[PDB]
Amino acid sequence: RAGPVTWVMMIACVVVFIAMQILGDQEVMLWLAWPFDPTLKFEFWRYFTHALMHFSLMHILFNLLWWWYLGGAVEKRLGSGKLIVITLISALLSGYVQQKFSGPWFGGLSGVVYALMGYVWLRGERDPQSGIYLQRGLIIFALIWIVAGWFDLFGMSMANGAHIAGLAVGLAMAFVDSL
Ligand SMILES: *C(=O)c1cc(N)ccc1[C@@H](*)C(=O)OC
Known part of the structure; x- marks a missing residue:
């Protein structure tokens, strides 16, 4: 089954998603969004908690499916701290x-x-002895996911700076780790 970190992230995203349905999206964003006013700059959780918010059923479902699989794999083979x-x-x-x-x-x-996509792939492709990798088939679907993000094929108003920065980060960490 899913490790503790894989699990608590999923439950946290579900809890937050419920709060957004009950209270509305904007209201939850007041609390959890990246600082949108200078008065909020020291509320350090905001630099991270934006990742807990989802704006539709598909948004949350696909993210958590991927997280469940890729995150679960990282935690099992490399440990909770690494996933953190x-x-x-x-x-x-x-x-x-x-x-x-x-x-x-x-x-x-x-x-x-x-990030998890780039990480699991490059790390398997550069450090097979790590005991983690992205199976051939899932490489294909990961690539399609990336393509969909880059070309705005999801039908989301959200921009996609988050997407490329995430992937870049995952690749960079795999690079460093395979050394
Ligand atoms: C995804 O979670 C996300 C988040 C932000 N902030 C911007 C864009 C995207 C793109 C996306 O949902 O790809 C699936």
Whole structure:
């Protein structure tokens, strides 16, 4: 079954998604979004918690499916702490880039997912002895996912700075780790 980190991320995203349905999207964003006013700059959770918010059923479903699979794999083969760090780094960096180009009103675990895609792949392709890799078939679907993000094929208004920054981060960490 899914490790503790894989699990708590999924439950946290579900809990937050429920709150967004009950209270509305904007209201939850007041609390969890990247700082949108200078008065909010020291509320350090916001640099990360944007990743917990999803704006539709499909948004959350596909993110959690990928997270469940890729995150679960990282945790099992490389440990909980490693998944934690990939998650914090990709969340922080993807938010930063997204914000830079589009402002603070955004959310979604997809920055982390793309990081996990790049990470699991490059790490298997450069350090097979790590005991983790992205199976041939899933490489294909990962690529399609990336293509869909890049060309805005999801039918989402959300921009896609988060997407490329996430992938770049995952690749970079795999590089460093395979050394
Ligand atoms: C994904 O979670 C996400 C998040 C943000 N902030 C911007 C874009 C995207 C793209 C996406 O949902 O790809 C699936």
